[model samples]
Target: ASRLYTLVLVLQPQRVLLGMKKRGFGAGRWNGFGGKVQEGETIEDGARRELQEESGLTVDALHKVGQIVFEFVGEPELMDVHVFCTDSIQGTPVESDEMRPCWFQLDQIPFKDMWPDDSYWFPLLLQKKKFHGYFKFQGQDTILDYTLREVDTV
Candidate 1:
């Protein structure tokens, strides 16, 4: 897969799973459910597939939200994280070998396992809002930050 569309789906009751890096820099940090694009699959398709296969959740409606483009410099592979949001779907979230899927209530989230930056912007997404933000962290320390205008009507 040359590129991928990673999804961050959120819906009422705000039910979703959490993930984290187990090795290297971001070890022991929680994030969304997504991975690299599959062979000959579209962005949304990959998102749906990953969701169902990994968490047993199905996609009813999905939309492209944003993207994260970065480079490792002369590594020969440019990394682009395509972000998506899905509000409609079916099926219950379940655990897998890569992740231990569990439901988190809207009010009480396990912030301890997630990245520190999630708290600042994730709430807005649950509110049906949009935003664009960038976080640069290397080995447990952030070096830079940037965000565009809030996604009011985009």
Candidate 2:
């Protein structure tokens, strides 16, 4: 059993938008903007709403790039995350109560300050590849096991 969530990354020519999570589940980590998909809302719509709410960026179109599942050792519920990306957006990213938005150059991504699983799949994203991944974590920082593969469709 799992909960549906969305994560959207804003990609530009040589940089990607990441937000420093300020509170809650992923606090202190630099991550994409997204959260739980609301009841009655479509997955992509939830991604757009979360992006706007967390970073004040409005994206008109989102490309479905990946799907990831996260399972914590002691947790019963899984996190089913749909990953999206967009190169087109309106409004500059502005800081919100939950996140501080910033752009990081492709070569300067701070993988150490992000979820451990990011370092694995992020490279595929940068290459414009669709992927599917599963990560089992002992805690927030340790990856107990994982599987990732590039795919034609995610």
Model 1 lDDT, residue 83, Cα: 61
Taking every candidate in turn, the Cα RMSD to the unseen true structure, in Å, is: 3.6, 0.6
Candidate 2 residue lDDT tens string, 1-154: 9999999999889999999999999999999999999999999999999999998889778999999999999899999999999999999899999999999999999999999999999999999999999999997988989999998978
Off by over 4 Å in 2: none
The C-alpha lDDT values of all candidates are 0.61, 0.95
Residue 20 lDDT in candidate 2: 96
**Global Cα lDDT for candidate 1:** 0.61
lDDT of 2 at 127: 94
lDDT, candidate 1, at 7: 57
The reply for model 1, stretches above 4 Å from the true place, is 1-3, 19-27, 69-79, 140-143, 152-154
lDDT by residue (47-72, candidate 1, tens digit) is: 77777766778877876665654333
Give the Cα error of residue 39 in candidate 2, in Å. 0.7
